[PDB]
Amino acid sequence: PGPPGPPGARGIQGPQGPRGPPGPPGPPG
Amino acid sequence: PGPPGPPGARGIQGPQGPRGPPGPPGPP
Amino acid sequence: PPGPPGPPGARGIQGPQGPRGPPGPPG
């Protein structure tokens, strides 16, 4: 038998990270 | 024919997630 | 002859969490 075939293709792009947290409350009025 | 080739590498990292929304109103 | 191409890689790592949003409006 021949040598092993070429390496497989690189996988697809990973998922986006989660949304960041809401900002802090505003300063006093 | 020889055996199947090795698996490919993991893909590129995903993008940064979206920014959070603006925060709440401050106090009176 | 050589064998066929290997399987595709898995999906990439998750991206980082997004940035915290801006401070809120004055009260």
CB–CB of C1/B1 below 8 Å? yes
Q: Contact at 8 Å (CB) between B14 and A13?
A: yes
**Amino acid letter, A1:** P
- In this structure, what is the dihedral angle of CA atoms A11, C13, B15, C23, given to the nearest 10 degrees? 170
User: What resolution, expressed in A, was reported for this entry?
Assistant: 1.8
| Residue B9 CA from chain centroid, whole number | 16
One-letter amino acid of B24: P
Experimental method: X-ray
Name the C residues in 1-27 with CB < 8 Å from any B CB.
1-27
Q: How many CB atoms lie within 10 A of CB B1?
A: 12
How crowded is residue B7: how many other Cβ atoms within 10 Å of its Cβ? Answer: 16
Answer whether C5's CB lies under 8 Å from B1's CB. no
**Which chain B residues are within 8 Å of C6, Cβ to Cβ?**
4-8
Q: Shortest Cα distance from B27 to chain A (angstroms)?
A: 5
